[PDB]
Amino acid sequence: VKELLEAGVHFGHERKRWNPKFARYIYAERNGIHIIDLQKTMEELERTFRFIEDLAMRGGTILFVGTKKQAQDIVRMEAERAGMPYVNQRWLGGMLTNFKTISQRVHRLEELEALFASPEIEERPKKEQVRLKHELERLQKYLSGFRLLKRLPDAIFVVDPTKEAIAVREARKLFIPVIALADTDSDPDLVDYIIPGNDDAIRSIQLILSRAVDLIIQARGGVVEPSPSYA
RNA sequence: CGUCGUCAGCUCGUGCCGUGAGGUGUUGGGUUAAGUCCCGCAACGAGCGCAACCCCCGCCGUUAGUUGCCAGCGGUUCGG
Ligand SMILES: [Mg+2]
Ligand SMILES: [Mg+2]
Ligand SMILES: [Mg+2]
Ligand SMILES: [Mg+2]
Ligand SMILES: [Mg+2]
Ligand SMILES: [Mg+2]
Ligand SMILES: [Mg+2]
Ligand SMILES: [Mg+2]
Ligand SMILES: [Mg+2]
Ligand SMILES: [Mg+2]
Ligand SMILES: [Mg+2]
Ligand SMILES: [Mg+2]
């Protein structure tokens, strides 16, 4: 499922803004830039996917996290397809570590979904209409992919582990295994199942996350063909 | 009951940080009479206060017309 001209898409980046634990996954340093050994990226995509596979055919949830502008939209796409939860926007603190309390805020999300599905009163004072709606958009704005999550995931997939160290931390505290794509600005040992590739190119984020979803649906019940990529 | 003080404040739940007292939230940019609301944030909510809900005066309408009122008619001892 794997493809080999990811060279055509990503082969990493970043200058000496590195982390030296990532040494093992590195070929050489060219444009004043850390260049990732693709043959290692390979050994790993495999091992990661083997983990990814076993998780779909047992029907286990995956939490998708990425909020840097690059991976922002493409997680709303690729995760919706597998219908699995995500946070695209802001990563609220304690989403895993304080799940039951965070979630007590989705019942509020649902409660507005009902209360706005009419009527249950519109003789509620005018501003109160306007007020509650604003709240609705707000919840929707962060929680739109989170609600799908009704229990702690059996695993989580992250786009930037550094950028989302909080996430990685919360998972790790819970024993929730962490899969992530990650370039040289990151700490390897911190990831269980790892994709050493560029994490800032919309090209790259695209290849890696898509084939993930494609591998999810394929061993889940079905197969599908192409899904949206911004040119 | 006074008072600080009608001052915008004081907490809590769970999460997180710290060996610990404790921190965070409640800080931060803007805005407000105000922890008033906005945005941002390892926090997310909740409580008591703020506010609002009550009384008063200011505008109008309705329901009422005596012991209250008198615009027009009629008288009128000259006092609706
Ligand atoms: Mg990066
Ligand atoms: Mg606490
Ligand atoms: Mg200390
Ligand atoms: Mg502790
Ligand atoms: Mg405390
Ligand atoms: Mg305070
Ligand atoms: Mg404090
Ligand atoms: Mg301030
Ligand atoms: Mg005041
Ligand atoms: Mg308040
Ligand atoms: Mg705040
Ligand atoms: Mg009051």
Swiss-Prot record:
Pfam families: Ribosomal_S2. Keywords: Coiled coil, Ribonucleoprotein, Ribosomal protein, RNA-binding, rRNA-binding. InterPro entries: Ribosomal_uS2, Ribosomal_uS2_bac/mit/plastid, Ribosomal_uS2_CS, Ribosomal_uS2_flav_dom_sf. Residues 98-143 form a coiled coil. PANTHER family: 30S RIBOSOMAL PROTEIN S2 PROKARYOTIC AND ORGANELLAR (PTHR12534), SMALL RIBOSOMAL SUBUNIT PROTEIN US2M (PTHR12534:SF0). Belongs to the universal ribosomal protein uS2 family. Spans the head-body hinge region of the 30S subunit. Is loosely associated with the 30S subunit. HAMAP family: Ribosomal_uS2_B. This is Small ribosomal subunit protein uS2. The lineage of its organism: Bacteria, Thermotogati, Deinococcota, Deinococci, Thermales.
